[PDB]
């Protein structure tokens, strides 16, 4: 039973992706004479990692766990793009399109505020090579963008920003600005992100996946002023394959 | 050190509430 | 000699120190509520996103604040006119984040003040004395409503409320000129009107008074010790007061009916400002000040700028620069 | 715009919306005839 | 320090605006002998037309 | 300074003849525009796209070229996008489409010179203000 | 080593000429016949190596390909830059009257 | 004009307390 | 004892002259309708919107059907005519009765007529004249009703393909819904009464408060008060008054909002656009036009890191982005259409856009309910130029302005009708002032 808008608004559905039976365990055969794409991929975190700073030696802090506190505003969906056969019989998508970021805050133990653009932007991902068949022991391995957390005309609270704003301290007229270069000069960010896709659930019939994912990328640096935080996310996905 | 000023000082304005209501001279007639 | 009316008693006795009263029962939980949740607010709590950018403001002192620049800050925009009490957020930390405790604050502060002003008519009623005083306290009361409820009604958003603090009530006022005009709004213009002409007649009727007094103490006590509380002749000669007055100005422009003369000094400032609350509150629904941009032009049709023009100047510094992050497209509609 | 037939009271139709304000005018003339009493 | 004197790419003197006490800040407008804008530090960058980069002070 | 006939002197054609408005034409030019354009096009600029305002320098390098009567009384008919490569007359008021923009019904072909006029005059009156948006007022 | 990237852009022909990878769309008003058909097709296909690989965009008519050639000396290619090009800043920077 | 009109409905009303005060009436 | 300018008090015990009184001022406000009508037809000018023209009673005619066709245009004017000049008539006919009873009538009733005469006091004669006008109210709402099935229909802004004058067939009877409405929550996304969204559920709770009314009514006229309710009110003239005063105050508020948020019994066609929907129509004209440029609006970050034409509420709805987000709960039919699931379709909106919506949110956009006290339309920093304030902005700040006053009047009387009920209205007696009999505070 396919529900209406007036059935969804209020109640965080529409943040959820769409589930599989927990039948769907069939298998999706692909013929490489055949061209492919995805006509909705919806990923849904469902748990936020901050790696910590352990300050000492060899250590190597741990991922510890966070609050989320921007509420159900975390999904990237209507994501679509190519999926390509590869003269080895492995699959790539290529993203398109979609809403494939959103910006988040969760809160650390201590109360530290760390936002973060969840996304896969621009993310290309594969399967192994002979695939022939989507099945519910398919991966997709793949890396993405994740672009500055704020663009280029964001100000910060004196006015400074990169395309627009002030370019120094105005407040301190004749302090001395090599102590406030960091935050004077602001900059872009573009760093890379990695995402595993692990295929659970698959309508043979109708050609949609469902399963888990894992991705790691940067957290925000506030275009630079501080050092970012290193972020694993794990959620559910579901995607919507098509002859194309 | 200025938190605990501000504080203070606004905790003893309470205080002073108290004591102006209950511990006022109480008016007298003639 | 039945329980309930023994309470009924104790409720409405005029032998509490403080009356307590039906409204009072109202009153005093919710002002207590928001009285402990502001204080804790302002000293405690971490920034808020109000403008629902992601972009937290910090208002409490241990996040860096002073009296004077402290806040307790409005709510999301992102939650917009939405109910937000404590058990629709996931956690406490999301809904401070998001700016509950605004909420909850205003609200309680509403309902007490509110029913404080019901406890004046019910007082009023027990000690057999006439009706009105709490009509006078519906001007003040009007005005809060105004900036913390209909403002923000007529906006769509609890985010453009009046935030809870001394530079938050400045940022109000600033915003609210550049996209208002209130200045040249009749409505406000009454309320300085309300408030100076309160002021002065304030002043003026201390000053008669005091003028004569009638002579009752040493040159070394207070003349204040002339008066003994519950004495039933006048203290002061309101004659004299009226001779001098009228000779001031010119006789029929003076009071000598002291009931005509203290409903005018409740009239004048309640007045006032019931006008200057309407102000807000009709601009709450973008009704806004005289707009004389332009109006003179000459022969050609160049325009000849009048103070009018020079305030927009300054109306237009005010508007590109609010919420600097928070606007996509290019007019603020709201 | 009125139809054609009544066109002739356009200046009477733009002044009738007042009328009722002049009620309250006119009960302060009264007043003044009988001294505010 | 000594005098600064600023020129454009095209060797013309130019001046610095001088801040008025009444302003807390002040932008930076650089003006040749005639009063007429030849460079500045512009705060919205995309449609500047007075950049110290593109008049070369 | 007054409304003398070089200031309400405006191209007719891409020819270079011209045309000198009444100044019942342009006060007439001026009332219609506000009637029928102000809502978007107060002060010379759009509103509802801003990259594209009323300057006599943007009329003059749009294809089919504005920058006089006739361009602009046939843009009141038929306008076309800035490069004319395709006709807009579904979302933009005009004669082709006075059924869809009911103001444009009772416009007779006066009252578009006189609209056409009045959009020509302007920045001569006020410069830079015309079509420079806010910060210019 | 901390330089604002969109004044060092402004150093470069991107501040004096329409530059094909990065000038937002708004510009290319500045020239005829270029807004807006052209030019979403230039913005939809950069980035371009050199201003000559604007005439290889796959679909132009001849006639667009002579109102290319006009205005070939108004253009200019630098590098991408990922400030000016990110957020989709290329079809509006937020930049209005 | 408009004027004309609105001339004779506000002399109206101050006419029909006039008559009442020149015939000694329930005023 | 009353002085002249609390003159009006004179007439509570003087029943003849109090009718006059009632129905004096009743034929001013049958005038004001006939003559305002006729006004705004004199200067209607059909090919211009309605809220082009400052026109509210002409919306409130064309709403229940009279005049308009397909998408609200106006097709004959002359049933606008008609109910300002019927309404215009009738106030000759309560203007004679009014001053006859006021002037030459008996001054009091009681005497002439046991059914006419009425004393505040006489509970039993008060709740009669009570069922008596909830009967006419009942009758009042079925009106309504009978105009929606019976009569042509009413104007549908939802209709398909524009909105139209439409019968209702199925008015909505479930008390479910009738009743739902009035436990919504009034905060955003609720909206209590206000956010009736179909001419269905106009009709059918028009039914039951209809029958309500009549029930009520009748119940009025059988019954005398219980005690309970005796011994919890005033019984007086002037307490009467100060029941009604709060009432009226309560409903002021209410149609303000009403006005403000309700695009369904106020078409926007009419009156123009709301606040919320003006703001959501920039955002939808910017998404159109920046999309046909080539911007992919769907992944297009803006600076703060949020989308710039679209992200999601905080229940996951995807939305228009800016400070429109406030608004996203914002329903009207110009807009539906995009909406999924999910909220806004992405495939819609790269797909399904057509003309008339890019032309109704310009349209909007460039209407929204901003513009100064003269009447100049937009924000405050705007030129002079358009001659434009919204009717729901006028519509909506005298009736709060007028709603705040009668509040202010609830309290004055009932205060007054409390005090003067005990005896203490004219100041305490000397002789026996109370505080001084109550022992001191302390
Ligand atoms: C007896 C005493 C009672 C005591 C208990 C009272 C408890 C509640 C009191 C009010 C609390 C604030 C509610 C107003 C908040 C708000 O969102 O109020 C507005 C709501 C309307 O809600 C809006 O309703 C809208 C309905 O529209 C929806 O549906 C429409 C249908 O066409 C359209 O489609 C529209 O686009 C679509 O959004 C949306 O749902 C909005 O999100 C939602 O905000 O109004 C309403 O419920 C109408 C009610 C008006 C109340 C406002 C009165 C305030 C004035 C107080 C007077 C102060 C005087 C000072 C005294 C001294
Ligand atoms: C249903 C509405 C209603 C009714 C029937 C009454 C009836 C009454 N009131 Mg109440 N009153 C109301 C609403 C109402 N009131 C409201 C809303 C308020 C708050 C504003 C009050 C506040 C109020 C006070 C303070 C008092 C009364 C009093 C009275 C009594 C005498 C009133 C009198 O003689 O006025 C005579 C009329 C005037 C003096 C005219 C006033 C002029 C108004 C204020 C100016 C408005 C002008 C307008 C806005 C624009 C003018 C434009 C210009 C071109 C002319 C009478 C029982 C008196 C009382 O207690 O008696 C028992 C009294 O003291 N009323
Ligand atoms: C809607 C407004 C309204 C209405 C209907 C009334 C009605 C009334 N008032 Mg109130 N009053 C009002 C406003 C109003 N008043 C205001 C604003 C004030 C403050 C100035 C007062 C102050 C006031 C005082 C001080 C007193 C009243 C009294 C009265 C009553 C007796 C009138 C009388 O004897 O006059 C006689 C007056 C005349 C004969 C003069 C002519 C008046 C007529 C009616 C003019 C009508 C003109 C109209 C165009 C004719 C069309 C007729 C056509 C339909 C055929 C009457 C029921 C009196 C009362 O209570 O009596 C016991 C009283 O003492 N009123
Ligand atoms: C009560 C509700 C109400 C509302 C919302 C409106 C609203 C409107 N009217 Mg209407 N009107 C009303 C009552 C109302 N009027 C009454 C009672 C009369 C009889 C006098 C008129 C007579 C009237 C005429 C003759 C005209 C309008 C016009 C207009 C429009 C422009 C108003 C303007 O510029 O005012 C300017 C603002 C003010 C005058 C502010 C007054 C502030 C007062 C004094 C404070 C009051 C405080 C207390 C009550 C607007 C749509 C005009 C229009 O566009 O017609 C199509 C027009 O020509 N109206
Ligand atoms: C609600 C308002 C109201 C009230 C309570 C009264 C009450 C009274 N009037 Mg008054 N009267 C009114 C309105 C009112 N009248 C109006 C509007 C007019 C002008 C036409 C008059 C003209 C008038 C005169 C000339 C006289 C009275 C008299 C009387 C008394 C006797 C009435 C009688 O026996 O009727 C008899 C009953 C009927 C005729 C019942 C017939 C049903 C009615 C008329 C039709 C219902 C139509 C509906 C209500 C609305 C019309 C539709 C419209 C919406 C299009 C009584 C105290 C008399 C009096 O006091 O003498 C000393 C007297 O001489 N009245
Ligand atoms: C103009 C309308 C009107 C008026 C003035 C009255 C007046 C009266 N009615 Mg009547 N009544 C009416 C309409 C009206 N009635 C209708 C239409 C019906 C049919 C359903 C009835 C059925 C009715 C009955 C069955 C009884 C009365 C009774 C009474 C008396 C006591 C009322 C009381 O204590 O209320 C005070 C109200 C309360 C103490 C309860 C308030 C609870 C409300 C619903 C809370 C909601 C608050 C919130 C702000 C409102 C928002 C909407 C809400 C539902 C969410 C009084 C004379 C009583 C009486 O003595 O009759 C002989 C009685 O027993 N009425
Ligand atoms: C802030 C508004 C306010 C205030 C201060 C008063 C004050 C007064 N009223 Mg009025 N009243 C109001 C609004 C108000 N009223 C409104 C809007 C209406 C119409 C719906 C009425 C209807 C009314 C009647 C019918 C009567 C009074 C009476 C009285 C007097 C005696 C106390 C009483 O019975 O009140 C009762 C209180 C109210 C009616 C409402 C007060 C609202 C308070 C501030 C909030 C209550 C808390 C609320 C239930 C909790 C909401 C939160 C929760 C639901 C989430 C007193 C002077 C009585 C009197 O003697 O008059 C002659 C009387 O019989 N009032
Ligand atoms: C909003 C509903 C508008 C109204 C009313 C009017 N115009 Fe307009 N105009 C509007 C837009 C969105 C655009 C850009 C169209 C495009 O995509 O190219 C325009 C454009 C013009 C132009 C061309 C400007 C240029 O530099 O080439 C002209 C000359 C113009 N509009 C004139 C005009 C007139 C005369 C109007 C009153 C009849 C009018 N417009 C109303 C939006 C709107
Ligand atoms: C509809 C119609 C009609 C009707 C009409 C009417 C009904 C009228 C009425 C009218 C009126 C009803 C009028 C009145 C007027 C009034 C006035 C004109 C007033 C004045 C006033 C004044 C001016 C004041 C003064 C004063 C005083 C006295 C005291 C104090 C001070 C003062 C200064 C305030 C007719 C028949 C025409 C026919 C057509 C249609
Ligand atoms: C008591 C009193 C009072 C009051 C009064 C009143 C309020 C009255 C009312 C009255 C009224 C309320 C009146 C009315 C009237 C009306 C009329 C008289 C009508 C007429 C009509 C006509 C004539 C019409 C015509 C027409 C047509 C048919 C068509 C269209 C056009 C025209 C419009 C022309 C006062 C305060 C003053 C004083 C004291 C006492
Ligand atoms: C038509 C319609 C509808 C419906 C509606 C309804 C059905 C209604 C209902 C309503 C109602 C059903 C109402 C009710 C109300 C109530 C009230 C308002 C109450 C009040 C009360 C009071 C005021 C009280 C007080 C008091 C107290 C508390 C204590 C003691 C004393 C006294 C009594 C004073 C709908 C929406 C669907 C839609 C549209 C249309
Ligand atoms: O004035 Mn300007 O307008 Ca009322 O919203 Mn749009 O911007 Mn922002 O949130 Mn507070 O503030
Ligand atoms: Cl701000
Ligand atoms: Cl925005
Ligand atoms: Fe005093």
Redesign the interface.
């Given at each position: 039973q396919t529900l209406t808008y007036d059935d969804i608004v209020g109640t965080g559905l529409a943040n959820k992706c769409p589930t599989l039976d927990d039948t769907a365990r069939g298998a999706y055969p692909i013929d490489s004479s055949q061209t492919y794409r995805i006509a909705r991929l919806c990923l849904q975190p469902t748990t936020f990692l901050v790696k910590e700073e352990p300050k000492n030696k060899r250590q190597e802090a741990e991922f510890v766990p966070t609050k989320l506190v921007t509420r159900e505003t975390t999904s990237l969906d209507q994501i679509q793009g190519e999926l390509k056969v590869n003269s080895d019989g492995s699959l790539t998508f290529v993203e398109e399109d979609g809403i494939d970021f959103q910006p988040v805050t969760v809160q650390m133990a201590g109360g530290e505020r760390i936002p973060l653009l969840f996304t896969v932007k621009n993310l290309v991902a594969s399967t192994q090579p002979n695939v022939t068949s989507i099945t519910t022991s398919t991966d997709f391995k793949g890396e993405f963008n994740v672009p500055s957390y704020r663009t280029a005309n964001f100000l910060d609270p004196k006015g400074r920003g990169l395309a627009s704003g002030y370019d120094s301290a105005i407040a301190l007229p004749q302090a001395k600005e090599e102590e406030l270069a960091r935050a004077n000069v602001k900059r872009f960010s573009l760093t890379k992100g990695q995402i595993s896709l692990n295929v659970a659930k698959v309508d043979g019939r109708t050609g949609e996946i469902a399963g888990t994912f894992e991705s790691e990328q940067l957290s925000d640096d506030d275009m630079g002023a501080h050092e970012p935080h290193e972020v694993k996310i794990q959620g559910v996905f579901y995607a919507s394959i098509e002859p194309a | 050190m200025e938190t605990i000023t501000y504080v203070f000082i606004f905790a003893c304005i309470i205080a002073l509430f108290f004591f102006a209501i209950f511990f006022r001279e109480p008016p007298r007639i003639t | 000699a039945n329980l309930w009316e023994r309470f009924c008693n104790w409720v409405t006795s005029t032998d509490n120190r403080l009356y307590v009263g039906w409204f009072g029962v109202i009153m005093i939980p919710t002002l207590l509520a928001a009285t402990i949740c502001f204080v804790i607010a302002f000293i405690a709590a971490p920034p808020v996103d109000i403008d629902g950018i992601r972009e937290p403001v910090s208002g409490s002192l241990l996040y860096g604040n002073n009296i004077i620049t402290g806040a307790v800050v409005p709510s999301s925009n992102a939650i917009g006119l939405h109910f937000y009490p404590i058990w629709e957020a996931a956690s406490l930390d999301e809904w401070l984040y998001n700016g509950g405790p605004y909420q909850l604050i205003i609200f309680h502060f509403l309902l007490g003040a509110s029913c404080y002003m019901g406890r004046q008519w019910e007082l009023s009623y027990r000690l057999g004395m006439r009706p009105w005083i709490c009509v006078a306290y519906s001007a003040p009361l009007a005005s809060a409503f105004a900036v913390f409820l209909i403002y923000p009604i007529g906006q769509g958003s609890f985010s453009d409320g009046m935030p809870l603090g001394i530079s938050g009530t400045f940022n109000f006022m600033i915003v609210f000129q550049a996209e208002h005009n209130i200045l040249m709004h009749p409505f406000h213009q009454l309320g300085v009107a309300g408030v100076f002409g309160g002021a002065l007649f304030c002043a003026m009727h201390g000053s008669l008074v005091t003028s004569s007094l009638i002579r009752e103490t040493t040159e070394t006590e207070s003349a204040n010790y002339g008066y003994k509380f519950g004495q039933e002749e006048e203290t002061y000669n309101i004659v004299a007061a009226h001779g001098y007055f009228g000779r001031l100005i010119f006789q029929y422009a003076s009071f000598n009916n002291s009931r005509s003369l203290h409903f005018f000094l409740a009239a004048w400032p309640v007045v006032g400002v019931w006008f200057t609350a309407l102000g807000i509150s009709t601009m709450a629904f973008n009704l806004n000040g005289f707009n004389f941009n332009h109006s003179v032009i000459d022969a050609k049709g160049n325009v000849i700028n009048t103070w009018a023009d020079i305030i927009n100047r300054a109306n237009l510094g005010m508007e590109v620069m609010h919420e600097r992050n928070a606007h996509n497209f290019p007019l603020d509609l709201a | 715009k009125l139809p054609e037939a009544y066109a002739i009271f356009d200046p009477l139709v733009d002044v009738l919306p007042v009328i009722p304000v002049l009620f309250l005018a006119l009960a302060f003339v009264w007043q003044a005839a009988v001294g505010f009493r | 320090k000594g005098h600064a004197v600023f020129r454009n790419k095209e060797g013309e003197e130019l001046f610095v605006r001088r801040m008025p006490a009444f302003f807390?800040?002040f932008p930076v407008i650089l003006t040749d002998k005639n009063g007429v804008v030849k460079a500045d530090?512009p705060?919205?960058?995309?449609?500047?037309k007075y950049?110290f980069?593109?008049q070369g002070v | 300074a007054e409304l003398t006939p070089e200031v309400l002197t405006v191209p007719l054609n891409s020819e270079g003849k011209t045309i000198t408005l009444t100044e019942k034409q342009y006060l007439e030019g001026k009332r219609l525009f506000q009637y029928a354009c102000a809502s978007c096009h107060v002060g010379g600029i759009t509103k509802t796209n801003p990259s594209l305002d009323l300057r006599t320098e943007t009329l003059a390098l749009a294809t089919p070229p504005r920058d006089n009567i006739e361009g602009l009384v046939d843009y009141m008919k038929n306008p076309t996008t800035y490069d004319g490569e395709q006709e807009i007359a579904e979302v933009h008021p005009s004669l082709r489409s006075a059924d869809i923009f009911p103001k444009m019904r009772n416009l007779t072909e006066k009252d578009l010179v006189a609209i056409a006029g009045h959009i020509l005059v302007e920045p001569k009156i006020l410069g830079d203000k015309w079509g420079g948006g806010k910060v210019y007022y | 080593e901390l330089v604002n990237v969109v004044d060092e852009k402004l150093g470069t022909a991107y501040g004096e000429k329409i530059d094909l990878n990065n000038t937002n769309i708004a510009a290319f008003i500045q020239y005829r016949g270029l807004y807006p058909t052209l030019a979403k097709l230039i913005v939809k296909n950069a980035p371009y190596e050199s201003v000559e690989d604007v005439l290889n965009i796959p679909g132009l008519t001849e006639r667009q390909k002579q109102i290319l050639r006009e205005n070939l000396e108004h253009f200019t290619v630098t590098e991408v830059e990922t400030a000016l090009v990110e957020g989709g800043d290329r079809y509006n920077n937020g930049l209005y009257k | 004009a408009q004027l004309t009109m609105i001339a004779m409905i506000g002399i109206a009303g101050p006419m029909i307390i006039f008559l009442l005060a020149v015939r000694r009436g329930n005023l | 004892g009353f002085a002249w300018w609390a003159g009006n008090a004179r007439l509570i015990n003087l029943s003849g002259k109090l009718l006059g009184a009632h129905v004096a001022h009743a034929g001013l406000i049958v005038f004001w309708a006939g003559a305002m009508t006729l006004f705004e037809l004199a200067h209607f000018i059909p090919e211009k919107p309605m809220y082009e023209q400052g026109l509210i009673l002409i919306p409130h005619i064309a709403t229940l059907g009279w005049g308009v066709g397909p998408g609200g245009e106006v097709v004959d004017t002359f049933p606008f005519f008609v109910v300002g000049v019927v309404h215009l008539i009738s106030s000759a006919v309560l203007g004679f009765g009014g001053v006859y009873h006021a002037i030459r009538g008996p001054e009091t009733l009681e005497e002439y007529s046991s059914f006419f005469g009425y004393d505040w006091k006489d509970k039993n004669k008060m709740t009669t004249i009570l069922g008596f006008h909830l009967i006419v109210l009942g009758i009042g709402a079925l009106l309504l009703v009978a105009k929606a099935m019976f009569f042509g229909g009413l104007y549908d802004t939802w209709a398909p393909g524009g909105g139209d004058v439409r019968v209702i067939t199925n008015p909505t009877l479930d008390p479910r819904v009738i009743f739902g409405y009035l436990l919504k929550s009034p905060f955003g996304g609720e909206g209590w009464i206000v956010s009736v969204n179909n001419l269905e559920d106009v009709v059918g709770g028009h039914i039951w408060i209809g029958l309500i009314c009549i029930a009520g009514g009748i119940w009025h006229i059988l019954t005398t008060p219980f005690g309970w309710a005796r011994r919890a009110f005033i019984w007086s003239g002037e307490a009467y008054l100060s029941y009604s005063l709060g009432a009226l105050s309560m409903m002021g508020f209410i149609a303000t909002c009403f006005v403000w948020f309700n695009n369904t019994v106020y078409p926007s066609e009419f009156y123009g656009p709301t606040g919320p929907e003006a703001s959501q129509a920039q955002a939808m004209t910017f998404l159109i036009r920046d999309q046909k440029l080539g911007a992919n609006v769907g992944s297009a970050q803006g600076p703060t890191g949020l989308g710039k034409y679209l992200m999601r509420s905080p229940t996951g709805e995807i939305i228009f982005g800016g400070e429109t987000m406030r608004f996203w709960d914002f329903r009207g039919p110009w807009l539906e259409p995009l909406r999924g699931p999910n909220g806004l379709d992405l495939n819609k909106i790269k797909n399904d856009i057509q003309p008339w919506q890019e032309r109704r949110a310009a349209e909007y956009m460039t209407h929204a309910p901003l513009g100064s006290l003269n009447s100049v339309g937009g924000v405050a920093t705007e030129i002079n130029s358009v001659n434009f304030v919204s009717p729901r902005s006028w519509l909506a700040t005298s009736h709060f302005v007028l709603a705040f006053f009668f509040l202010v009047g609830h309290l004055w009387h009932a205060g007054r009708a409390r005090a003067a009920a005990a005896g203490f209205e004219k100041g305490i007696d000397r002789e026996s002032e109370p505080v001084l009999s109550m022992p001191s505070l302390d």
């Open positions: - | - | - | - | 807390e800040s530090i705060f919205r960058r995309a449609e500047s950049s980069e593109q | - | - | - | -």
